[PDB]
Structures are given as C-alpha cells and as structure tokens.
Design an enzyme around this catalytic site. Sequence first.
Site, PDB file in Angstrom:
ATOM      1  N   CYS A 226       0.807  -1.217   0.000  1.00  0.00           N
ATOM      2  CA  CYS A 226       0.000   0.000   0.000  1.00  0.00           C
ATOM      3  C   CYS A 226       0.844   1.274   0.000  1.00  0.00           C
ATOM      4  CB  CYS A 226      -0.947   0.031   1.203  1.00  0.00           C
ATOM      5  SG  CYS A 226      -1.878   1.594   1.317  1.00  0.00           S
TER       6      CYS A 226
ATOM      7  N   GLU B 243      -4.721   3.593 -10.732  1.00  0.00           N
ATOM      8  CA  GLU B 243      -5.496   2.355 -10.523  1.00  0.00           C
ATOM      9  C   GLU B 243      -6.631   2.260 -11.528  1.00  0.00           C
ATOM     10  OE1 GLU B 243      -6.096   1.189  -6.173  1.00  0.00           O
ATOM     11  OE2 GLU B 243      -5.849   3.410  -6.032  1.00  0.00           O
TER      12      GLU B 243
ATOM     13  N   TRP C  85      -9.289   6.149  -0.674  1.00  0.00           N
ATOM     14  CA  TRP C  85      -9.615   6.775  -1.949  1.00  0.00           C
ATOM     15  C   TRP C  85      -8.630   6.291  -3.003  1.00  0.00           C
ATOM     16  CZ3 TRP C  85      -8.640   9.925   2.432  1.00  0.00           C
ATOM     17  CH2 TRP C  85      -7.323  10.405   2.529  1.00  0.00           C
TER      18      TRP C  85
ATOM     19  N   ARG D 294       0.036   4.802   2.819  1.00  0.00           N
ATOM     20  CA  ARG D 294       0.218   4.581   4.244  1.00  0.00           C
ATOM     21  C   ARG D 294       0.518   5.820   5.069  1.00  0.00           C
ATOM     22  NH1 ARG D 294       4.131  -0.395   4.704  1.00  0.00           N
ATOM     23  NH2 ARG D 294       4.469   0.042   2.476  1.00  0.00           N
TER      24      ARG D 294
HETATM   25  C1  HEM Z   1      -6.302   6.462   1.922  1.00  0.00           C
HETATM   26  C2  HEM Z   1      -6.161   6.243   0.595  1.00  0.00           C
HETATM   27  C3  HEM Z   1      -5.396   5.004   0.064  1.00  0.00           C
HETATM   28  C4  HEM Z   1      -4.679   4.938  -1.067  1.00  0.00           C
HETATM   29  C5  HEM Z   1      -4.426   6.072  -2.081  1.00  0.00           C
HETATM   30  C6  HEM Z   1      -4.162   3.598  -1.191  1.00  0.00           C
HETATM   31  C7  HEM Z   1      -3.382   3.139  -2.226  1.00  0.00           C
HETATM   32  C8  HEM Z   1      -3.184   1.816  -2.533  1.00  0.00           C
HETATM   33  C9  HEM Z   1      -2.802   1.275  -3.823  1.00  0.00           C
HETATM   34  C10 HEM Z   1      -2.595   2.090  -5.126  1.00  0.00           C
HETATM   35  C11 HEM Z   1      -2.698  -0.045  -3.678  1.00  0.00           C
HETATM   36  C12 HEM Z   1      -2.335  -1.061  -4.780  1.00  0.00           C
HETATM   37  C13 HEM Z   1      -3.677  -1.415  -5.402  1.00  0.00           C
HETATM   38  C14 HEM Z   1      -3.539  -2.412  -6.525  1.00  0.00           C
HETATM   39  O1  HEM Z   1      -2.738  -2.156  -7.465  1.00  0.00           O
HETATM   40  O2  HEM Z   1      -4.259  -3.446  -6.470  1.00  0.00           O
HETATM   41  C15 HEM Z   1      -2.991  -0.394  -2.297  1.00  0.00           C
HETATM   42  C16 HEM Z   1      -2.957  -1.657  -1.752  1.00  0.00           C
HETATM   43  C17 HEM Z   1      -3.349  -1.994  -0.474  1.00  0.00           C
HETATM   44  N1  HEM Z   1      -3.795  -1.090   0.508  1.00  0.00           N
HETATM   45 FE1  HEM Z   1      -4.075   0.930   0.258  1.00  0.00          FE
HETATM   46  N2  HEM Z   1      -4.540   2.880  -0.086  1.00  0.00           N
HETATM   47  C18 HEM Z   1      -5.352   3.691   0.684  1.00  0.00           C
HETATM   48  C19 HEM Z   1      -5.991   3.319   1.855  1.00  0.00           C
HETATM   49  C20 HEM Z   1      -5.937   2.064   2.421  1.00  0.00           C
HETATM   50  C21 HEM Z   1      -6.652   1.603   3.598  1.00  0.00           C
HETATM   51  C22 HEM Z   1      -7.688   2.429   4.390  1.00  0.00           C
HETATM   52  C23 HEM Z   1      -6.270   0.337   3.838  1.00  0.00           C
HETATM   53  C24 HEM Z   1      -6.725  -0.630   4.953  1.00  0.00           C
HETATM   54  C25 HEM Z   1      -7.071  -0.175   6.167  1.00  0.00           C
HETATM   55  C26 HEM Z   1      -5.308  -0.024   2.837  1.00  0.00           C
HETATM   56  C27 HEM Z   1      -4.650  -1.214   2.770  1.00  0.00           C
HETATM   57  C28 HEM Z   1      -4.147  -1.782   1.645  1.00  0.00           C
HETATM   58  C29 HEM Z   1      -3.830  -3.189   1.489  1.00  0.00           C
HETATM   59  C30 HEM Z   1      -3.987  -4.343   2.498  1.00  0.00           C
HETATM   60  C31 HEM Z   1      -3.309  -3.335   0.075  1.00  0.00           C
HETATM   61  C32 HEM Z   1      -2.848  -4.668  -0.554  1.00  0.00           C
HETATM   62  C33 HEM Z   1      -3.944  -5.308  -1.403  1.00  0.00           C
HETATM   63  C34 HEM Z   1      -3.417  -6.562  -2.081  1.00  0.00           C
HETATM   64  O3  HEM Z   1      -2.391  -7.154  -1.625  1.00  0.00           O
HETATM   65  O4  HEM Z   1      -4.038  -6.983  -3.097  1.00  0.00           O
HETATM   66  N3  HEM Z   1      -5.077   1.062   2.029  1.00  0.00           N
HETATM   67  N4  HEM Z   1      -3.240   0.776  -1.612  1.00  0.00           N
HETATM   68  C1  LIG Z   2      -8.352   0.440   0.279  1.00  0.00           C
HETATM   69  C2  LIG Z   2      -7.804   0.574  -1.132  1.00  0.00           C
HETATM   70  C3  LIG Z   2      -7.512   1.824  -1.690  1.00  0.00           C
HETATM   71  C4  LIG Z   2      -7.013   1.898  -3.000  1.00  0.00           C
HETATM   72  N1  LIG Z   2      -6.709   3.100  -3.557  1.00  0.00           N
HETATM   73  N2  LIG Z   2      -6.821   0.767  -3.717  1.00  0.00           N
HETATM   74  C5  LIG Z   2      -7.107  -0.465  -3.198  1.00  0.00           C
HETATM   75  C6  LIG Z   2      -6.862  -1.735  -4.004  1.00  0.00           C
HETATM   76  C7  LIG Z   2      -8.011  -2.185  -4.905  1.00  0.00           C
HETATM   77  C8  LIG Z   2      -7.934  -3.695  -5.113  1.00  0.00           C
HETATM   78  C9  LIG Z   2      -8.884  -4.538  -4.520  1.00  0.00           C
HETATM   79  C10 LIG Z   2      -8.836  -5.925  -4.684  1.00  0.00           C
HETATM   80  N3  LIG Z   2      -9.749  -6.742  -4.099  1.00  0.00           N
HETATM   81  C11 LIG Z   2      -7.828  -6.482  -5.464  1.00  0.00           C
HETATM   82  C12 LIG Z   2      -6.871  -5.659  -6.062  1.00  0.00           C
HETATM   83  C13 LIG Z   2      -5.785  -6.285  -6.918  1.00  0.00           C
HETATM   84  C14 LIG Z   2      -4.945  -7.322  -6.163  1.00  0.00           C
HETATM   85  C15 LIG Z   2      -5.491  -8.720  -6.386  1.00  0.00           C
HETATM   86  C16 LIG Z   2      -5.699  -9.206  -7.688  1.00  0.00           C
HETATM   87  C17 LIG Z   2      -6.210 -10.494  -7.875  1.00  0.00           C
HETATM   88  C18 LIG Z   2      -6.440 -11.026  -9.268  1.00  0.00           C
HETATM   89  C19 LIG Z   2      -6.503 -11.278  -6.753  1.00  0.00           C
HETATM   90  C20 LIG Z   2      -6.285 -10.760  -5.466  1.00  0.00           C
HETATM   91  N4  LIG Z   2      -6.571 -11.514  -4.373  1.00  0.00           N
HETATM   92  N5  LIG Z   2      -5.787  -9.501  -5.310  1.00  0.00           N
HETATM   93  C21 LIG Z   2      -6.930  -4.273  -5.891  1.00  0.00           C
HETATM   94  C22 LIG Z   2      -7.595  -0.575  -1.896  1.00  0.00           C
END
Ligand code: HEM
Ligand SMILES: Cc1cc(N)nc(CCc2cc(N)cc(CCc3cc(C)cc(N)n3)c2)c1
Lengths: 404, 405
Positions: free
Chosen positions: B109, B286, B281, B112
């Site tokens: 993420c 994305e 947000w 953070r």
């Molecule tokens: C506040 C605005 C936020 C922004 C701009 C942001 C941004 C992002 C982005 C760009 C990703 C990668 C998404 C992707 O390519 O799939 C990501 C992943 C992630 N974020 Fe955030 N985030 C935000 C808030 C949060 C919040 C509130 C949480 C949880 C409390 C969070 C937890 C996570 C987690 C666990 C991932 C990993 C998801 C995965 O492994 O598929 N983020 N974040």
């Molecule tokens: C809170 C928040 C804010 C923000 N700006 N962006 C996000 C991430 C959005 C997201 C959500 C999900 N469920 C999966 C992915 C790809 C990752 C992925 C891909 C596949 C194919 C399977 C899997 N388990 N995870 C991205 C979250």
Amino acid sequence: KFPRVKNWELGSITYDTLCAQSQQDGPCTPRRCLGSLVLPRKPAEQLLSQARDFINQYYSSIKRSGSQAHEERLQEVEAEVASTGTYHLRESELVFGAKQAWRNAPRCVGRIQWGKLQVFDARDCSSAQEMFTYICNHIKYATNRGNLRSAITVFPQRAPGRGDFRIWNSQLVRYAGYRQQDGSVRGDPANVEITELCIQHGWTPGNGRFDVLPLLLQAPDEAPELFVLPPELVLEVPLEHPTLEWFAALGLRWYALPAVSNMLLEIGGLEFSAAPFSGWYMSTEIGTRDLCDPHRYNILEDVAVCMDLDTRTTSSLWKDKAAVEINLAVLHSFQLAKVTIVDHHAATVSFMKHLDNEQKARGGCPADWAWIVPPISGSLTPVFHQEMVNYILSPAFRYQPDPW
Amino acid sequence: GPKFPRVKNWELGSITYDTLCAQSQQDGPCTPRRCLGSLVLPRPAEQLLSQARDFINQYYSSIKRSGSQAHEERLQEVEAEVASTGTYHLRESELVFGAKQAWRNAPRCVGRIQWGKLQVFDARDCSSAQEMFTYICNHIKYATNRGNLRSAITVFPQRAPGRGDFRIWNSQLVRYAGYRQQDGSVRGDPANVEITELCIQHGWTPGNGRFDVLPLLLQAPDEAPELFVLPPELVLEVPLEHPTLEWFAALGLRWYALPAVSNMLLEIGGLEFSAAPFSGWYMSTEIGTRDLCDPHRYNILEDVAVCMDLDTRTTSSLWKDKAAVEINLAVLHSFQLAKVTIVDHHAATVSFMKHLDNEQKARGGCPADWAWIVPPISGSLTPVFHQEMVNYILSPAFRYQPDPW
Ligand code: HEM
Ligand SMILES: Cc1cc(N)nc(CCc2cc(N)cc(CCc3cc(C)cc(N)n3)c2)c1
Ligand code: HEM
Ligand SMILES: Cc1cc(N)nc(CCc2cc(N)cc(CCc3cc(C)cc(N)n3)c2)c1
Ligand SMILES: C[C@H](O)[C@H](O)[C@H]1CNc2nc(N)[nH]c(=O)c2N1
Ligand SMILES: C[C@H](O)[C@H](O)[C@H]1CNc2nc(N)[nH]c(=O)c2N1
Ligand SMILES: [Zn+2]
C-alpha cells in the site's frame, strides 16, 4: 521446491526447474526480500569443481558429452589446477562462456539476441597501449556505421600473484560531468568522479554538456593511462522531434553504443576483470533515464515549459507528457540517423518470446522483474504481468569494486 | 557497518538501515537461492497464545505502559480466556490499534501516510446477513461522505472454533459486472466474470451494460450467502471526460468513487477476522492505467488511440503511452470536477517517501513491496523508483484468503 510462475494477463502457468542449478546465493532470506537492492553487500577444491561444471556445460553444448575429447579436457584442467592453482580456457570455451554469461544475466531484457555475440579474444594483451587498440577495434566493429552488432572483448584473466587489468570507465563512451563553483554540474552528473580522475591523470577538459571522456586503462600494478578516442570512432545522434520543431534547438544528443566496461566476467571459476561488452540501446534508457532522471540531465521541466504545459501542479501530468515526447524524439532520431535502436514495447515482446524459448530449452530463465519492466509505461508492456524468478547462474557478469 | 539491511536512495545518495525487519515472525517466499519477490500470491493453543502475547505487548508499548500492572493483568486475562475457551476477544481500543497497525504494516500500500487516520467501525455484534448489509451500507455512506472520502474499516465477528465464517463473497464492495458473450468476449469487466455468474445463480436479474454495479453476496455463519442490491443513491460514480479532448465524454466511460476491499483477512494477535472490509480513496493510475487499459480488463487503449488518430500499426509511435497518459489525465480531471477525492501517482509517491522517513524515525524501517509501490505508468519519474525497499511480513496484517466457494 520448484516455484509456480504465472502470467496474469494470459492466465498461464510454468514451473521453474532451472533455479535448482544455482550454486550462488543472492541477498534474500525467508525473513526478508532484498530483491530491490541494486548492489547487495556480498583455493583448489572450489576452483576445480566450478571448472568441471563449466567444462561439463561446454561439452554438453556441442553434444559431445562423455566423449574422449571431454574426458581428456577434464584431465588437462585437473592437471593444470593441481600444479599451478589455476588454468586457461581454450578460445571456443571462452566464446561459449561469454554467450552463456549474457544468457544468464537476469537484469537484461535483450537476451533473445544471446546466441549472436562477437567474441574478441584479447587475453594476449600486455599493456594499456594494446588494450586501447583492442578497444578501438571493438568499437569500430560494434558500431558498424549504425548497423550495431553485439560484441565482447575479453582481456587477460585475474591471477593470484598480481593486480588486475581494468578499464576505469564504467562505459566505453560516456559524457563528462564538470562540477561548478555554484555546486551544480555541467554535463552528466553520473560522471563527475571519473571526469575528475581523467583531469587528475592529465586530460585537458572541455566545457560542454556532451564532451566524450577519454579512457583510463590500467595494466597490472601500473598507474592507469589516458587515451582519447578518435572522434570518428564515436558515433553520435543529434536529437530532433518529428512534429515539435523547437526540440532540435535544445542541442541534445546521445551516442550510438552502450558498452559496459566495469563488470567482471566469471567463467568456470576464472575471473575476467576487463571484458567490455556492447549491444544496442532500448530507447527508454536514453529518453527516460539518461535525459529525464532528476540526478542525470534532468531535462523534463525544460521540455515541459517548451511544450507550454502547466508545471504548477502534478495533476496536469506534465512530467508524463514531456517524458513521452522525449522518448519519441529518441526513437525518431535514431531511426532518422539509421542507428539500431529498439523501443520498450518491441523489446519486452521479444523478451516474452525469450522466456518461452528458455522454458523449453532449460526449464526456466532468471529474471529481475524490477529491471526488466521499463521505467515508463510499465503495465502497458507484457512483462509487467509476468511473474519472474531471480537467481544466479554461472557463467555470469558480476559487479566489482572501483579500481581507485 | 551495522548488521541489518542497508537501504539506498539512488536519486539522493542517502542511506538507512532497516532494523524493523528484526520484528518479523513470519517467513516470506524468498530464500538465498532464489528471489520470489515478484509473485502476486506466494504459497492450536500454543501458537495462538504466543501471537496474542506479542500483540498485547505491541498494544502496551504503543500506549507507553509496557511492564505495568495493567499490562501483566491483561496478559494473565488473555491466557485464562484461551485456557477455558480456546480463543479470546480484543478490547475495543485493542481492535482500533490493531486495524491501524495492519494498514501500517501492509507492504503493497502506497497510501500509508494516512494510516493513523482510519475510522474503525466495530461490528463484532453482527449476527445475520441482513445486519451485515446494514453495516456495509453505513460504511459506504460514511466513507463516501458525498465525495469528501474518509478511510474506514468495518470489523465483523472473528473466526470461531467449529462455527462458520462471516464472508463477503465480492472482492470489492463496488464492482462492475462482467457478462460472458456468445462470441467468447466479455461485456463489462472481465475480472468479475466468476462473481457475476455466482450472483446470477443466487437469483440476481442481470443487466446488460458495461458498468452494471454488482450486488453483494453476504454469508453469515453456516448459512448460504444472501443477495443484497446496493441502492443506487449510495454508490457514487464519476462520468469520465477529458479537459481538452471533447470526444472523450462520448465514450461513456465511468468509474466508482470508493475503492473498498472486501475479501481480505484481518489478522490481529492470532485472531482472524474473515470479514473486515476497508476503504480509502483511489490513486488515479489504478483506474486510468490498470482498470481501463489492462489487456485483460476494459482494454480501451486502442479505442482511445484511434480517436486520437495515432499510428496503432507500429510500436515506435508510442501510441500506447500517449493514449494511457490522456486516459489518466481524464480520470484525474473528472474526479476533480466532480469533487471526489483522488490522488495522482506523483503526489501519492511523494507522500509515500515522507511516510518512509516518518517510519524510519518511529520504528526503524518500513516494509515495502517495490513492484507494487512503483506506479504502473511513469515509474522512474516518481521518487519511489530510485528507493531501495525491504519487504517482510509484520503482524497485525491483512492477508489473502481462499475464495469461499
Ligand atoms: C487512503 C487512501 C489510500 C490509497 C491512495 C491507497 C493506495 C493503494 C494502492 C494504489 C494499492 C495497490 C492497489 C492495486 O494495485 O491493487 C494499495 C494496496 C493496499 N492497501 Fe491501500 N490505499 C489507501 C488506503 C488504504 C486503507 C484504508 C487500507 C486498509 C485499512 C489499505 C490497505 C491496503 C492493502 C492491504 C493493500 C494490498 C492489497 C493486495 O495485496 O491486493 N489502504 N493501496
Ligand atoms: C483500500 C484501497 C484503496 C485503493 N486506492 N486501492 C485499493 C486496491 C483495490 C484492489 C482490490 C482488490 N480486491 C484487489 C486488487 C488487486 C490485487 C489482487 C488481484 C487479484 C487477481 C486477486 C487478489 N486476491 N488480489 C486491488 C484498496
Ligand atoms: C543487443 C542489444 C541489447 C539490449 C537492447 C539490451 C538491453 C538491456 C537493458 C535495457 C538493460 C538494463 C540497462 C540499465 O538499466 O542499466 C540491460 C542490462 C544488462 N545487459 Fe543487456 N542488452 C543488450 C545486449 C547485451 C549484451 C551483448 C550483453 C553482454 C554480452 C548484455 C548484458 C547485460 C548485463 C550484464 C546487464 C546488467 C547491467 C547491470 O547490472 O548494470 N546485454 N540490457
Ligand atoms: C556503475 C553502475 C553500476 C550499476 N549497477 N548500475 C549502473 C546503472 C547505469 C548503467 C551502467 C552501466 N555500466 C551500463 C548501463 C547501460 C546498460 C546497457 C548495456 C547493454 C549491453 C545494452 C544496453 N542497451 N544497455 C547503464 C551503473
Ligand atoms: C531502487 C531500484 O531497485 C533501482 O532504482 C532500479 C529499479 N529498476 C531499474 N531497472 C533498470 N533497467 N535499470 C535501473 O537502473 C533500475 N534501477
Ligand atoms: C507480475 C507482477 O508481480 C504483477 O503484475 C504485479 C506487479 N505490480 C503491481 N502493482 C500494483 N500496485 N498492483 C498490481 O496488481 C501489480 N501487479
Ligand atoms: Zn526476494
């Protein structure tokens, strides 16, 4: 044991079995991944088993594995190590080894070309003077009036009783960086230190943005010596833009030949401290990294202002827009000047083919994802969506300390 | 030098050492022999109690009461609960700390810097699918705040011994349907073909558009999942237009305001929260790069390049890069116009560098997944590209979990 490797665009899966052939540890452990580090922090019996492994690789490559020529060559190497603590490669083995080091290079996206490499044997070099002649021939050959040809020149191996043959420059062709009173740099900021060394060893410096550095070549246990490259050997490309006329007026230019000169080539336990190699550029190296990096020529803002973009806010994406036009100017200018270049789309597509070729040939291919994915437009290329396994196979190119 | 990973920024030439990785109690997928860092998903009362003790120690350190009577008493109370029931429960403020720490610990993420500012909704009293829906709707209303978006997470009851899990079947609270066509192609979002087909099987009357908001499939313990349509007024969407390309609005593209992940497991001190959706947000890439331009997603690059009149027959015209930039600019501009929170990839990565500096001073490091942190366009143009990063698993954590079907 064998990692499952997925392409997320196509849903296809392979298993990497090649990685079991790695005898060398990288920087990662189960507690933490250090895969994003650029350089991480890292006797007869050992040499003999690397020598054997490599000779075994070579005879297998010529489909003569187990023959008499094979057994007798193993004995020669054994006899030589047991008497002298070292041994020497036959030229054919050296040619095989160089191509294999390139094949095994995980940070190289140009590896579809690996079978096509001109190997110059320069192991009979005994002076900086001779080194210079070999380097001039390499450049002439590789450049080939713009029709670039991959080449490597291999200088004498490291020996226990003495200092290394070394090329002090990091590339055969680089531009000088002159530190100014006001702390800013004129020219390429990546090259300030080597520029200062050249001056210290007697070079009369220029004062431009694109002054080609002289070579500092070092024979064993001797001070390095300075040699200017004849300007006719150093092909350069003036940069213009297809539609933006003011771009030529930036006076920007780049050299045709990317030729790494500071890496160590390791073959069968033997180390080649000077073994410069060259291919051709992928356009993003020039357009994005060399010209746009904030710690390099850093031209982005100037291009943006010429384009009349709103530089006040990041959300106008002025940086992205300017970077695109700069990369386009690079491709167009090399195409116009008839100098080999590949764009990052064509390059990554050929790398995917290479991955498939190597899967069939060897059951895997070591690849460093962070280096393979281009520095702009990552996910717009097929390599972004491809999982990769990174490991060290030998023969290999390695980093080595700076000689000074 | 120090016996910890040395970390370099190559733009600035500055060095740090990561000491935080010492706290990692969980192995990643890498070994000395091979790096598996680019893999998306890498493959009892004794174990629970040690994880619980560890978390309670983390909690008491954060409130500066480490070694105190209250700390020793909470430890005693946790092991006694475990000794008679097999599990234990978190105090409300422990849950708040734990949820924030899970976001703080998430290597992938980039958002953070905001970690300390997370509204935690405690929904551990929920006992049916109907009530989950009410809770989720309240989360969406609060988080959306008519465009002025607010980070939030809602936590449903934890996994219990021999009792079914609370699960949200959808991967996000808001997703578009993907309908498989007779020609093999997909109308809508190809990422969502499976969940769309599950919704239909469970009684949803499907639409036939490119941007049909999916219903929620919600599962209370030991029950079949139940279907719930989100009332349209709750789901804020943004029609897409370009600031200078007038035809872009005619493409009928749109995206939703709220990115809300709903299929991740929240683990805190050995306790597993299988339903704990969280939302922030968007970062503009994305939507504009991945959701719209991925070849396996909406795949609109070619369409947009034809409208821009680019040479799509050759790679060297950089038509893909040019179209991608304008799609990204359209996303930013439309969200701004609509007054919906969004952050561009330049501001996000700059704020992430500030976060790395904060965490260096606060904790001696920050776990970061370089491939995920660097944005999918304009990589080296952002400061994170030149920053070496160390990746490791800390707890509390968000984890992937298998799909409930
Ligand atoms: C506040 C605005 C936020 C922004 C701009 C942001 C941004 C992002 C982005 C760009 C990703 C990668 C998404 C992707 O390519 O799939 C990501 C992943 C992630 N974020 Fe955030 N985030 C935000 C808030 C949060 C919040 C509130 C949480 C949880 C409390 C969070 C937890 C996570 C987690 C666990 C991932 C990993 C998801 C995965 O492994 O598929 N983020 N974040
Ligand atoms: C809170 C928040 C804010 C923000 N700006 N962006 C996000 C991430 C959005 C997201 C959500 C999900 N469920 C999966 C992915 C790809 C990752 C992925 C891909 C596949 C194919 C399977 C899997 N388990 N995870 C991205 C979250
Ligand atoms: C044929 C044209 C070639 C192309 C287009 C190409 C492409 C590239 C690119 C883009 C990189 C990353 C560059 C950087 O970011 O610094 C690279 C790295 C590398 N390549 Fe190539 N390559 C080519 C030929 C070669 C040859 C001939 C060799 C050696 C025989 C070679 C060996 C290497 C090695 C060892 C690296 C890693 C360098 C480092 O770690 O700094 N490549 N290649
Ligand atoms: C000193 C140093 C160490 C290190 N680890 N990394 C760098 C990065 C910059 C750089 C350094 C070298 N030596 C060569 C290239 C061109 C790479 C290249 C080679 C070939 C053969 C073709 C091509 N297109 N590009 C780039 C510098
Ligand atoms: C810190 C990071 O690993 C470093 O900036 C890398 C990223 N990827 C790269 N990729 C290539 N091809 N060349 C590079 O110099 C780098 N730099
Ligand atoms: C193969 C590679 O690991 C995979 O495509 C990753 C790369 N980086 C990513 N980074 C983010 N933020 N999101 C992603 O989905 C991905 N995909
Ligand atoms: Zn790793």
